[PDB]
Amino acid sequence: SRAGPKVTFYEDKNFLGRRYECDADCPDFHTYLNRCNSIRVEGGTWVAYERPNYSGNMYVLRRGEYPDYHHWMGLNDRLGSCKAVHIPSGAQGHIQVFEKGDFGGQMFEATEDCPSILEECHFREVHACRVLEGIWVFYEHPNYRGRQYLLPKGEYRQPVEWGAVTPAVQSFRSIAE
């Protein structure tokens, strides 16, 4: 965490056209950009949302260049808002996922990315989660695809508490910067 977070959204592919430079949470792009077809993340990790005020689908954006919306696995070229992800300092990521609600049933523990929950612990769904340290992104499908959910340090007694309407979770990634 040396430089401050910075992200630029562009209206056209390959970082062309009208752009919006952003260095803090922005709840509404639409006075600035009609569409988003490419993005450059210079510092920090960000989450962008399909619609203003942080609603609709979420997409994690890490450092680097996204020359078209497929690079962040957008459904299309519509983004409305974005937030900078705040990474706590100290112990690296530590997460527990539970086969049933309220931290019940079988538990699976990780300190690294998991590309397939089913492969590693044979859970088909996730119904609760404890993020002991760090901050993580849940993915609906194995291998870091499908709907995304952001889980800061805390306790999630059932999937609605990380914003999901189904218990579909099959991979996850820690956000270390």
Rounded Cα distance between 139 and 163, Å, is 12
Which domains, from first to last, does the chain contain? Answer: 1-87 (2.60.20.10), 88-177 (2.60.20.10)
Which residues are bridge partners to 41 per DSSP? 7, 64
Torsion of CA 132, 136, 137, 140, to 10 degrees: -30
Residues 95, 124 contacting (CB under 8 angstroms): no
Residues 27, 79 contacting (CB under 8 angstroms): no
Three-state SS across 107-160?
Answer: EEEECCCECCHHHHHCCCCCCEEEEEEEEEEEEEECCCEEEEEEEEEEEECCHH
Rounded Cα distance between 42 and 8, Å, is 8
* Helices and strands (H, E) in the chain, number of each type: 1, 12
What type of residue sits at position 96?
Answer: Q
Chain breaks in the chain (C to N over 2.5 A) after: none
In a 3-state reduction of DSSP, which class is residue 54? helix
Contacts of 123 (CB under 8 A, 6+ apart): 97, 99, 106, 108, 117
What approach was used to elucidate this structure?
X-ray
- Residue 17 is classified by DSSP as E
Resolution as reported, in Å: 2.3
